[PDB]
């Protein structure tokens, strides 16, 4: 049986994770206590006499995000041991989450994962959720991904990670932690999907016409991507794309494993009725820079490998027509050596909508996960931020005192520079 395990590290992983497990419960009919009044095996383990528990662990050094889950309305869903807490947070220090504090909790963390990896009959991958800007996300995320590769080799690590915005970011030391996390994320995860905070702000302001959005509006449509990602494991479809099919069909080289995301129909209740939602209409909007979920312009780079996951009432011909019209549009550009560039997956289940959510029901939906050379713009802009503060050794004495050495910033800069150089040559026309 198909089966995936999600580890959620750091506050951003938990707060998104509070929204993803709110989505799968409404989708599969599981009540907050954990009892339904066959497809649930992808995310839920059926426990004993009619109870389903999630296959996720919640680990964070700061308990104050975790105890909202323990005392919330989903207190009876999760196993009590799966919600893992610590004494004090890493507190925006990568040296504290990887060396000082993270070493005590990572030994316990692999123990509960080994319980979930023993309960599976066929394991298909891992779903990491973290933010590279924080100490827990960068530090404990690097340590957990390091130990997972040694323990469970050649398994797919689908790490949905959140990166700082080029313009609108909240933490000062975010450029430092992003570079040190990328040095470990580059060589370990199989598919890493960037999420950007500011791009989702522009999505909610324009398409969802909400002038003042907060984090719980942001994490709902992030959870719409994850449900659209794994809908082929839970529900049937015309063209099933398994999680193991993603990494063999998206990454061309072992080092270029960064991809974007875009959810095409994002409309409110009063917008939906006036809008004639057609397959060609949503497909055109998915490639627009407005509906991209990372703050970058895809016209600058060239798309390299894009996969579309059509959810709902979509026949295999209107995806045949829409993809052809997309390829003939002059704005969208593919790389020369990859003439086949599209993966079309259709799942027959329409997307579920949460009451209180700002999305209305839509019969058809598209999630595009795109490998592009324009991600080099997302990593050069953070390479510029890391260069200025390290030019006079800012904030270094917090990292040096907490276990990490001075030298590790040098090759982390070199490894990120080696990645930007690799991105330019793979987009080079030959």
């Amino acid at each position: 049986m198909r089966e995936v395990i999600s580890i959620h590290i750091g506050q951003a992983g938990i707060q998104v994770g509070n929204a993803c497990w709110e989505l799968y419960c409404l989708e599969h009919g599981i009540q907050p206590d954990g009892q339904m009044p066959d497809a649930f095996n992808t995310f839920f383990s059926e426990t004993g006499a009619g109870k389903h528990v999630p296959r996720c662990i919640f680990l964070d050094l700061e308990p104050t995000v975790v105890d909202e889950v323990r005392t919330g309305t989903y207190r009876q869903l999760f196993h009590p041991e799966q919600l893992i807490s610590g004494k004090e947070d890493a507190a925006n220090n990568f040296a504290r989450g990887h060396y000082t504090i993270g070493k005590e909790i990572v030994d316990l963390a692999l123990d509960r994962i080994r319980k979930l990896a023993d309960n599976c009959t066929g394991l298909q991958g891992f779903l990491v959720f973290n933010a590279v800007g924080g100490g827990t996300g960068s530090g404990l995320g690097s340590l957990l991904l390091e130990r997972l590769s040694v323990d469970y080799g050649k398994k797919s690590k689908l790490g949905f990670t959140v990166y700082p915005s080029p313009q609108v970011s909240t933490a000062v030391v975010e450029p430092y932690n992003s570079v040190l996390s990328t040095h470990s994320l580059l060589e370990h995860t199989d598919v890493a999907v960037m999420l950007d905070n500011e791009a989702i702000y522009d999505i909610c302001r324009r398409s969802l016409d909400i002038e003042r959005p907060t984090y719980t509006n942001l994490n709902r449509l992030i959870a719409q991507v994850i449900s659209s990602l794994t809908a082929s494991l839970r529900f049937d479809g015309a063209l099933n794309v398994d999680i193991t099919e993603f990494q063999t069909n998206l990454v061309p080289y072992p080092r270029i494993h960064f991809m974007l995301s875009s959810y095409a129909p994002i409309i409110s209740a009063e917008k939906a009725y006036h809008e004639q939602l057609s397959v060609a209409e949503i497909t055109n909007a998915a490639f627009e820079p407005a509906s991209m979920m990372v703050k970058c312009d895809p016209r600058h780079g060239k798309y390299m490998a894009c996969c579309l996951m059509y959810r709902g009432d979509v026949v295999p011909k209107d995806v045949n027509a829409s993809v052809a019209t997309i390829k003939t549009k002059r704005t969208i550009q593919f790389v020369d050596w990859c003439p086949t560039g599209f993966k079309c997956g259709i799942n027959y289940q329409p997307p579920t909508v949460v009451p209180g959510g700002d999305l209305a029901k839509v019969q058809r939906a598209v999630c595009m996960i795109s490998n592009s050379t324009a991600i080099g713009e997302i990593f050069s802009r953070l390479d510029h931020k890391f260069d200025l503060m390290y030019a006079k050794r800012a904030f270094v004495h917090w990292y040096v005192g907490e276990g990490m050495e001075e030298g590790e910033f040098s090759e982390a800069r070199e490894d990120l520079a080696a990645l930007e150089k690799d991105f330019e040559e793979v987009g080079a026309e030959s």
Partner: protein
């Protein structure tokens, strides 16, 4: 007594084969529960070609469903006509091919190919005489393209005197459903040019044009396309299952349609297709079926037959038809455009008639074409493969399961050899 063993591989072939047994069991009169409920006696002489007698009057298909994912097992099993297959013949994997040709052929197929050769040997030993192995798969995938071609080499070595009917869809020109089609197809065709006795080239986009330009269906699902593919496969063995005025089995088609041992890929068309608005107006006669037969839009392959010369074509006519009226229509198409026909092969076309038509439709025909116009299809895969291979894109996967790049140069060399001999005979 000419039995056919059907094996289905991959998501594409199993969904195609689900529609195949949907149509054949409807033709032979078997209901979904497996009992016989037909009204004719002509269906009850040759059931053995596709079915086995079971205790209690149950009819089980000679089908072996093989896959690396349990997802497409559940899709076939939950649809209509899904219970007919044996529960023991539902062999499947758990990890999944992942659209990796090397994982299907070397790593994950190895733990399963021994399990599926147990089933194939079991069914072949049961039937009295093997007339061929009918495998339905794809070439752009990994489950039926990678693991399926391993099954082609395995059956061909313990059974070297039997035909192989590899019904395989090819990557489409207009769109692309995976991204590793040139890597998947070129390696799968490399296995098919030796072991497979003859192959049937299909594609999605030629079915879409038939469903839209000819049948005028606005919303064609995969069930609409697979029924067009299943209408082919009933027409290939039409003379085997039913009595006919001029019989033609799978070897007689093979000895005529294949002049040379590497030219065994064919482009196939099913003739009597009309829209619901045009059923009452189209007067179906033998000249009318022949006019639709050689039309380029009725081909279920992307190759336009106007570009290449027809080395050998064969006609599988089904129904009560006048014999010369069948033949003089094929003589008319030989001479009204003789430049489209090969000069050094006189009498290119072959006509065979069966007096039992498919249900509801009194006149029908199936076109099999060994035209050199299909060199453009393999030329497209060759130029798509050479573009990716020089930059080594999507290659760190395939070298990971023990499939080195030495084999991939050999795939391109054998790909170019196939198109070289097709272009050699245009002159």
């Amino acid at each position: 007594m000419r039995e056919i063993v059907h094996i289905q591989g991959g998501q594409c072939g199993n969904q195609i084969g689900a529609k195949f047994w949907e149509v054949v069991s409807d033709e032979h009169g078997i209901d979904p529960t497996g009992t016989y409920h037909g009204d004719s006696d002509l269906q009850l002489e040759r059931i053995n070609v596709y079915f086995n007698e079971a205790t209690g009057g149950r009819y089980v298909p000679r089908a072996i469903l093989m896959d690396l994912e349990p997802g497409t097992m559940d899709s076939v099993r939950s649809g209509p006509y899904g219970q007919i297959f044996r529960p023991d013949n539902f062999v499947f994997g758990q990890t999944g091919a992942g659209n990796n040709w090397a994982k299907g052929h070397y790593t994950e197929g190895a733990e399963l190919i021994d399990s599926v050769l147990d089933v194939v040997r079991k069914e072949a030993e049961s039937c009295d005489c093997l007339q061929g192995f009918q495998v339905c798969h794809s070439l752009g995938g990994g489950t039926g393209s990678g693991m399926g071609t391993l099954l082609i080499s395995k059956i061909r070595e313990e059974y070297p005197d039997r035909m192989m009917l590899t019904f395989s869809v090819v990557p489409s020109p207009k769109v692309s459903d995976t991204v590793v089609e040139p890597y998947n197809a070129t390696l799968s065709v490399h296995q098919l040019v030796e072991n497979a006795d003859e192959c049937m080239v299909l594609d999605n986009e030629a079915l879409y044009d038939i469903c839209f330009r000819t049948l005028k269906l606005t919303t064609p699902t995969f069930g609409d396309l697979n029924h067009l593919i299943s209408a082919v496969m009933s027409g290939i063995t039409c003379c085997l299952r039913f009595p006919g005025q001029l019989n033609a089995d799978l070897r007689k088609l093979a000895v005529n349609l294949i002049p040379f041992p590497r030219l065994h890929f064919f482009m196939v068309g099913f003739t009597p297709l009309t829209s619901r608005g045009s059923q009452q107006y189209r007067a179906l006669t033998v000249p009318e079926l022949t006019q639709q037969m050689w039309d380029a839009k009725n081909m279920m392959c992307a190759a336009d037959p106007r570009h290449g010369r027809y080395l050998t074509a064969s006609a599988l006519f089904r129904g009560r038809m006048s014999t010369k009226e069948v033949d003089e229509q094929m003589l008319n198409v030989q001479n009204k455009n003789s430049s489209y026909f090969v000069e050094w092969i006189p009498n290119n076309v072959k006509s065979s008639v069966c007096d039992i038509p498919p249900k509801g439709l009194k006149m029908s025909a199936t076109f099999i074409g060994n035209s050199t116009a299909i060199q453009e299809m393999f030329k497209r895969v060759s130029e798509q493969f050479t573009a990716m291979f020089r930059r080594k894109a999507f290659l760190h996967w395939y070298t990971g399961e023990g499939m080195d790049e030495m084999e991939f140069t050999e795939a391109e060399s054998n790909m170019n050899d196939l198109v070289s001999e097709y272009q050699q005979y245009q002159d």
